[PDB]
């Protein structure tokens, strides 16, 4: 296939045009004026160390084979920090969450983009531990394009799994994350193969109006997202909240209720052969 070009969409329909800045082939040494390793030079994106028990290494990202590598690793003489608001833990149902045992790493793009297609041929840490690929930007929203958990002990739907987010961070917004606890829109990508048993393409072209995703260069229409569906035709227009300049994320994080993985599980490796962010000409 040609690179130029979505692997969705090799005759070009869309006008393509690379956003350089917020690609990458990883090639090359992790370029550090393109990308945020979190917690380089104690800058964390969003003050976010990572999600307890793990947390985020600067040690656990960095090119390799032609791949960026977030790695997993069984650590627990790593010198975990505590969180910006003084806590050794994270809240999680209620119980004090304690950071330890397991390093992750994050990597942020130090530019933002608003629309694009964005594409990722990668492979999930095979542990239980999460590959995802997502969105910020401040005060307004997150894209979580996929939640991977490649290493499922018990759930080959989840080996298989992209979970999908759309989360409002915008206490304006009535379905601000901190008013209704949870997502405005969540949905699980299920697509054929599981997610660590190989490299994978994964493509989101996201628009004003629609959010779709392709898999391998298949448009899967059963996910698609409408603005006329999720707003009611725009009757709740609260509902639509991807309208906003993001940041991309790649990272692994420990999620405790789905499982944690044990040293034997470890280390493991989120590989990630490219990002392709495309643009309207």
Same mark, same amino acid.
């Given at each position: 296939?040609?690179?130029?070009?979505?692997?969705?969409?090799?005759?070009? +329909?869309?006008?393509?045009?690379?956003? /350089?800045?917020? &690609?990458?082939?990883?090639? $090359?040494?992790?370029?550090?004026?393109? *990308?945020?390793?979190?917690?380089?030079?104690?800058?964390?994106?969003?003050?976010?160390?990572?999600?307890?028990?793990?947390?985020?290494?600067?040690?656990?990202?960095?090119?390799?084979?032609?791949?960026?590598?977030?790695?997993?690793?069984?650590?627990?003489?790593?010198?975990?920090?505590?969180?910006?608001?003084?806590?050794?833990?994270?809240?999680?149902?209620?119980?004090?969450?304690?950071?330890?045992?397991?390093?992750?790493?994050?990597?942020?793009?130090?530019?933002?983009?608003?629309?694009?297609?964005?594409?990722?041929?990668?492979?999930?840490?095979?542990?239980?531990?999460?590959?995802?690929?997502?969105?910020?930007?401040?005060?307004?929203?997150?894209?979580?394009?996929? +939640?991977?958990?490649?290493?499922?002990? /018990?759930?080959? &739907?989840?080996?298989?799994? $992209?979970?999908?987010?759309?989360?409002? *961070?915008?206490?304006?917004?009535?379905?601000?994350?901190?008013?209704?606890?949870?997502?405005?829109?969540?949905?699980?990508?299920?697509?054929?193969?599981?997610?660590?048993?190989?490299?994978?393409?994964?493509?989101?072209?996201?628009?004003?109006?629609?959010?779709?995703?392709?898999?391998?260069?298949?448009?899967?229409?059963?996910?698609?997202?409408?603005?006329?569906?999720?707003?009611?035709?725009?009757?709740?227009?609260?509902?639509?909240?991807?309208?906003?300049?993001?940041?991309?994320?790649?990272?692994?994080?420990?999620?405790?209720?789905?499982?944690?993985?044990?040293?034997?599980?470890?280390?493991?490796?989120?590989?990630?052969?490219?990002?392709?962010?495309?643009?309207?000409?």
């Amino acid at each position: 296939p040609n690179p130029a070009y979505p692997l969705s969409d090799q005759s070009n +329909e869309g006008d393509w045009v690379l956003n /350089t800045e917020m &690609s990458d082939e990883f090639e $090359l040494p992790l370029d550090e004026d393109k *990308w945020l390793i979190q917690g380089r030079n104690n800058e964390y994106q969003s003050r976010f160390i990572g999600r307890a028990p793990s947390q985020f290494s600067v040690n656990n990202a960095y090119t390799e084979s032609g791949k960026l590598k977030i790695v997993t690793k069984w650590e627990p003489d790593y010198d975990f920090r505590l969180k910006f608001n003084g806590d050794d833990h994270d809240v999680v149902n209620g119980e004090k969450i304690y950071f330890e045992n397991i390093t992750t790493a994050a990597v942020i793009s130090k530019k933002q983009f608003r629309y694009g297609y964005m594409e990722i041929k990668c492979k999930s840490a095979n542990a239980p531990i999460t590959s995802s690929f997502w969105t910020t930007g401040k005060n307004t929203s997150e894209m979580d394009m996929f +939640e991977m958990f490649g290493g499922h002990k /018990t759930n080959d &739907s989840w080996r298989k799994r $992209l979970k999908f987010n759309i989360i409002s *961070w915008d206490p304006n917004n009535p379905n601000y994350f901190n008013k209704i606890n949870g997502p405005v829109f969540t949905q699980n990508i299920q697509v054929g193969n599981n997610t660590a048993g190989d490299f994978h393409v994964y493509g989101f072209d996201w628009t004003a109006d629609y959010i779709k995703v392709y898999y391998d260069g298949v448009l899967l229409p059963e996910y698609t997202i409408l603005k006329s569906e999720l707003t009611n035709n725009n009757t709740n227009p609260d509902k639509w909240v991807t309208d906003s300049d993001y940041w991309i994320w790649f990272d692994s994080e420990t999620f405790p209720w789905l499982g944690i993985p044990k040293e034997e599980d470890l280390p493991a490796e989120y590989q990630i052969e490219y990002l392709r962010v495309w643009q309207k000409n």
